Design a protein around this motif. Sequence first.
Motif: not given
Length: 73
Positions: A23-24, A28-30, A44-46
Motif C-alpha cells: 500500500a505504501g 510513493e510510486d505515484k 495523504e499519499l505521504e
Amino acid sequence: KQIGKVPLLNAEQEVELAKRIEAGLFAEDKLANSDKLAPKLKRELEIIAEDGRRAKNHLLEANLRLVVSLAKR
DNA sequence: GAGCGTTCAGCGTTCGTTTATCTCCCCCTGGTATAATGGGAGCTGTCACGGATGCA
C-alpha cells in the motif's frame, strides 16, 4: 535488552503488515512520477508512504529475536 | 683483351621482428518459501599504596 518487549506476530497480524508495505509502495510510486497530483492528496499519499516506512520497521524489530537464534549456530 | 678478381649496389625474397587481433575459468553476485523468534560461560583466590568515588 535493546530488543526488549516488542510484539511477536501471529499469522493475521504479519500478513496485515505486508498489506501496508505494498500500500505504501504504490503510494510513493505515484508520488515518484513526474505528473502533478493535488497537494492535500499528496500529503495523504505521504501518510501512506510514511506508514509503509513504519510498517517496515515494525516488522523488522519484531523479528529481531529470530536472527539472534540462527546466529548461535 | 682473356679470364677471373674484389667489392660496392640496390634489389628482391621471403624470413625476420614486435605488434596487432581473437577465444576462455576463476571470481563475484543473487537466490532458495512448512515452521523455526532474546548466548552460553568462565570465572575465583598476590600485595601494598593511593586517590577517586560512592554513600551513610
